[PDB]
DNA sequence: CTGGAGAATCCCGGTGCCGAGGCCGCTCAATTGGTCGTAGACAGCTCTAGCACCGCTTAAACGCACGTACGCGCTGTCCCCCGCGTTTTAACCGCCAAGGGGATTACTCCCTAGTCTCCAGGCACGTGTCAGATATATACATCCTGT
DNA sequence: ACAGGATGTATATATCTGACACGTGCCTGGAGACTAGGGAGTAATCCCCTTGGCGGTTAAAACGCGGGGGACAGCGCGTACGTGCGTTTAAGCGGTGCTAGAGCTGTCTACGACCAATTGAGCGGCCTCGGCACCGGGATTCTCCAG
């Protein structure tokens, strides 16, 4: 038994949209946050709640950018998102 | 009732004291020095509670994972009339055992690890238990730990602690054990404070201790040697750059960037053990091995004393460490030497652990070195065969080390056990050894009853 | 002196008139603040509070819960055309995404 | 060699392909090209740089070595990225 | 401990029970509700302050807060918020 | 003679991208501003520069929207602007 | 009839097609569809409504019957449409 | 009383330190305001002013005209990446669009 | 009778002459420069005000302006500007 | 030298006075009452300056557009030795005339309109002029006008003003004319103030005026009749709704919306003239119907007095109005009556204007009504044939009306001219007529020299 | 491919003009100098919470291979833009005329901030208990295949 | 076209756990009630600037319609993305110990705001010779088409 291409994916669009959880693993993100900050100032410490504010803000930003990317893909009559659709969304938003 | 052999007179007196606690209706602590055969005193108590009081009811034992196969073996050996069962394994195996063995109620002793209890807590609270034995009871010293909370929710007619290090760091960590045994007596730590020259007054009713130096005059006493070592020139370089906090080191170019140091003490401790623990420190990305590695660590330069030992009869040795990577570099050294060895660690699966212990202990066994991580390998396992102990690292808690040494100094040890402790001379390893000794003073290894 | 009555009780409000007056006086908005300014502002903040909690409580009820949680609040704000304009640039934590799948994407029939 | 068994990736790689796919599924994306995964990492890194640089400017001004939750909330607010839930 | 922390939480709960007597609310949701009240307060007082300055006045009055509400809120919320503010100020003035 | 379709469109782009004049006629826009306003309040008079401030802001907004709209049509592999390209640009902007 | 010779259009129609075409050309548009004129008028009217409504709120607050250049500049500023040249 | 010396002369600036202090004091920015604050702010306002007018002057000479006009200012701000980031949400009156066609639209 | 209106025009003129001695400027370009100076003054002063409230201080000082400048200005503009302002305070405090 | 006919004794005396101004080196104003042949007194002066002083140099005349073809005709008739040329037409025609006629320098008088001067100002400033004659000089009364500025930049040996309404609204307006003539005498209006019972002292040196009542005893004096009229019921309705400002009226539904009234005075003035000027007011979108037009306007109800006049010999009539739409409704009324008529307005082309005037003035002409707009048709044109004048509207400035009446009362009028002025009784038209009469008092129609 | 013709801005030199820089006068906000009182620097202390390591469990991600929906290059198609000229209407600019209403200054007197004093709302605190969680079970959905 | 087979999804019931919910004790911002002195409001004055609309003149909008550009549907082709297997991996959760550095209280003294007094930068008013808009002369040089 194999489901047809595209049916498992729609099931997923439905699950993740219902849930409210964070999707990136948390240890991996904390390490990136800490590496980016070493460039600006050295030897900083971080409240446990401060990295969670960064992760909530980051995942909210990426989910919203993926909506604009999918409308720019469907405008060009495709269902597959591509790097050019991300770039047009970021240009029309002025960033 | 006890079949395969005889309890020594102190084991007989300990049994009579445990029976007297039961008949007086009290719980208590059995805390003989390590290597005094505490295990058999407990197995004999359960035989009594069945053969003489007619109580075949359920009893529980909690143990560290590395000792689950010893306890089971001993039940099978000395008192075969008890019906012991053991919980361990993957989710399917635990579900199958619960369904097909535990709930049927065809057994009288249940043996488990602390993780298996934390997983199956909702199953085990169904039963009403007659005895709850915890081993290495120092594990529950912090009352806010999840095991300590879970363990106080059980229905139990009787409670028992077995530990040879009843004192650990402070009087609150001992009160936390008394509050499991008699919560209605030691109502608070603020009440234990003040009660406290009040030596043995509170303790004698609920504690019994005997020392090998009194009760086993035939066992040879330990010999202890500190070996102070200098740093290598490479270690002296890194130890100074770490203090300055200009380690730099970046494998992805960026002119070496900077390594972050929010905790410098751990970086200094790593360095003392070996420079290669750090990134990019080994010379030559190909790696190469050979004596270049040996020449860069002041501890390893001295560790070639293993060659004298091997030639000096079978002075088989145990090596203890606190860092998992150090066992890696010691294992590459032993493989490059072509030595015969064993290794136990926290990563090891359960089945493998007991096979290793057995293979090393056989009467005709050829393994010279056993490498043990200090947390997983330092508790319960018995290895009377080896004559020597090496402590490569030093722990903030003095009691952790003491236990590790006693893996060898135990009943059945025919020969004097030598303990070698490595210390880098002008470094933070001095302060660590000084504080551990400051903590010994308040304990004083009280002999007690 | 006479026994105290809160200024919120005089205005017929649940939010605090006194705290609001202090906040305004110490926030460096103007060198003077009027007596009716804190009462008008407390009325508006309580009205806007009630508008959100009415929609959030309906969302909790439809989901069969007795307790409002951060997801119920998102659903309320984003399904109301004025609250979603008032709050178009705020991120609510543990607030999900309204469910929407574009039509082109769905299976054929 | 026991000593070299483990190998380390860059910290950007910790944002895995499975982690990006779920975010696009919450956004309602059905199918994704394979070059979108490196493009997304570049975009997040630019977002984190701009928020963190400011959160550290606030921390330095207060003469503290610890970044707090309020330092992050004020930086997001100043850029039009208001966040509720973490105080303020 | 040794330091108090003011919040709107008790006021949000007193209104909750008038709107829905049966329901309760979580601590995470109450923290979002405290953030909403703080954000809206800072918006309305920023427009009021500016209005006074443009017109060269020293005082913020209810007439400046009424205009700030009309500049900030969408049309159906603005007409109701102005009705609730004017009802409160009339009632307050009758007791004063 | 006849130039070819689109040749004079390029001269017009260049000519209007050099000059800074207002392109909409002034008197017709003044009547538009006044009608919209009579719904918000009646009998308003107006400063002459207040109408020029409204025209400058209005032509600046439309020119910028037509640039975002053109990018969208090129993205869809076309050269002619369509009503759906204005709608995509406004939607992605957040209007 | 001399009396009825002239006929009046709506005021939106005053924005003619020749003019929309020029504002597209300043924006670099080469070719335009015939439906855009209706669409562009709808879009400008929504822009003028939102700016004027606020410019009149400011005028009423000042108790004046004349809309000034400053009333327009403050309304554009409050919406993120800052304008230089007309004062302020 | 000694001869007066205006605070801008003491700091070596052309913009007015005294006026900036009044504007800050009466503008509701803080309960108090320090004496070094108007000096720092006047220096930054004069630097940013000189940064624009320098490039505006060059755009005027490129057009061969002696007076700066409002288009010259637009050509300067838009052609510099940092001034265009500082002034990214601003419209300038009598300001044209920088000359530009997407290459897709140019003839073969 | 007719009241005075303040502007930056005479300082803008004196700075132009220092940069390009022979160049002039039209009255409309002056209105735009006067608008620019006021926009940038209001941005810096608004950030400097908040930073003090966040840290619970009642005084605006050169340190709060320095942080405000680093938050608002782009990267290279910020560097040169910071140098110009710290230079001006160094010269002023030598001659106060 | 003058050929076609003989000047009258007052024209002879006026010529001798203009010559005496030239020989004294002064400029001056000729301001005889309208209808007194100022045009010929001027043409005769130029003939003198050529035949007796030997000055054939360039001379300029500025005129209203509607009189350019009269002036030219008169030059051709009385003094054929002057070489007069005329500038008028599209850009190509002006370029062709400048290139092929003006710059050649084969002419001695140049005749132009005020618009043609403002267009060709840079061409005409090349030449050095001997005389600059402005006619209807009241046009330059505001010194801040463009024409007034442009006109003071010319190189001119002599200047001259012709006007029959030398006073208009105030003493500054008259100073503005003196400052063109002798700018070095009347240096300022603050100096003319104070100089001012100072009647004729300043004026006599530089002004001459004669009145028809003194110098043409044979011309019949005017008869003036006010006719007060009530509003129609429809006008009474609109006049009340306009005052309330609840006009409503919206053709695109919207429940009639509201109409904007930033100036109510002009709305009230419109209504008095006719209700149909307003939108949606004429009953029935088809329109077509006609007797209803006469009824819904109190002025039009009375205007059927045109039927008595036509039957009462050829009392041919001129109708003056200030609103162009009113000539529309009067033209539809005349077309629906099948009357014979002419119309002149501001939108008429130049060629057509003079044809109309000629057709109406012919000895055997059959046209009964001439419709004239008051600002274009009210100045310069001569129409001695008509016996009657109707003023449908009333102007704020009294002098505008006076001129319009005089289009008929002039040399060559054989019969008494009747003037009828319509006034709606209880409306703002009362206040307009009262204000215009308040301004007449300060002028007083001074006879002067 | 490409010569040729012929409409496109493009320099060039003259002509006039009200924009911009100069100065005048004199207005009213900056600076000197003194004084007051309290923001904030600073030293010290306490003790919370942020950092490392390992032990142990098992969700999770890794890579492999399989096979199909859909990415995107050519072609034909035939509608609706672009460009021209024509005729046509209304925008721009100049003109006068009136009087709405921005603006000034002046007067008077309601409003709010200040102070001190006072006692009850709101803070954190600690504890019982019930919405919520999730375990097992099944019943009904919807997808997929092959015939 | 649509029969069973297979799968994930729904919800029924059970017991279970840990965030909410009450009330307690406690203490510091809100509230009383006068005096203070300015902002604010309202009168009245003056005269800047906005609303009509004719007259005249050009320019820009409008109409119509020849003709070739681009929009768009369809086909076929082919490799890049979905899917599921088994596999290996590190995130997570717990636990130990240490000590950096957030936080507080009590103390002391540089700083800024304030006042009154004096004087000069900066305001508006009145000015004018020179920047550069404009017109009408010729210069290449854009583009296009029929040889
Ligand atoms: N009575 C006894 N007879 C023989 N051997 C004994 C006896 N008691 C203890 N031992 C030996 O002690 C060793 C382990 O002792 P153990 O029970 O682990 O001590 P503890 O539990 O105190 O660490 C076993 O190898 C066993 O042979
Ligand atoms: N001396 C005269 N002889 C014959 N006809 C004359 C004489 N003077 C004037 N007219 C006629 O009287 C008419 C009015 O003259 P006009 O120049 O229009 O006077 P004004 O210009 O002062 O109104 C002219 O048409 C002219 O033909
Ligand atoms: Mg043991
Ligand atoms: Mg005449």
Author numbering:
A (entry chain A), F (entry chain E): 39 to 133
B (entry chain W), J (entry chain X): 174 to 369, 382 to 634
C (entry chain G): 11 to 119
D (entry chain B), G (entry chain F): 15 to 102
E (entry chain H), I (entry chain D): 27 to 122
H (entry chain C): 11 to 118
Provide passages from the article that reported this PDB entry.
Here, to address this issue, we develop graphene-oxide-coated EM grids functionalized with either single-stranded DNA (ssDNA) or thiol-poly(acrylic acid-co-styrene) (TAASTY) co-polymer. These grids protect complexes between the chromatin remodeler SNF2h and nucleosomes from the AWI and facilitate collection of high-quality micrographs of intact SNF2h-nucleosome complexes in the absence of crosslinking. We chose to use SNF2h as a test case because SNF2h adopts both monomeric and dimeric states on a nucleosome, with the dimeric state being more active. We generated complexes by mixing 500 nM SNF2h and 100 nM nucleosomes with a 60-base pair DNA overhang on one end in the presence of 60 mM KCl and 2 mM ADP-BeFx and directly applied 3 µL to ssDNA GO and/or TAASTY GO grids. Using this method, we obtain high-quality single-particle cryo-EM datasets and determine high-resolution structures of the SNF2h-nucleosome complex.
For the double-bound particles, we first applied symmetry expansion to identify the flanking DNA. However, we can only see clear density for ADP for both SNF2h protomers in the double-bound structure. We did not notice any significant conformational changes within the nucleosome between the current single-bound and double-bound SNF2h-nucleosome structures. The RMSD for a majority of histone residues and DNA base pairs were below 1 Å between the two structures with only the flexible flanking DNA exhibiting larger changes, as well as the histone H4 tail, DNA at SHL+2, and DNA at SHL-6 exhibiting larger changes from direct engagement with the second SNF2h protomer. In the other two variability components, we see the densities for the two SNF2h protomers alternate in strength, where one endpoint has strong density for SNF2h at SHL-2 but weaker density for SNF2h at SHL+2, and vice versa for the other endpoint. Since all the particles in this analysis are double-bound by earlier classification, this variability cannot be due to differences in SNF2h occupancy at either position. Therefore, these components suggest that there is increased conformational flexibility for one SNF2h protomer on the nucleosome at a given moment. Notably, the two protomers rock asymmetrically on the nucleosome, where while one protomer stably contacts SHL6, the other SNF2h protomer dissociates from SHL6 and becomes more dynamic. The relatively low local resolution of the SNF2h protomers (~5–6 Å) in these maps preclude confident identification of the exact nucleotide state for each protomer. However, considering the proposed model for SNF2h conformational changes during ATP hydrolysis discussed above, this asymmetric motion suggests that the two protomers are able to coordinate their actions on a nucleosome such that only one protomer will hydrolyze ATP at a time.
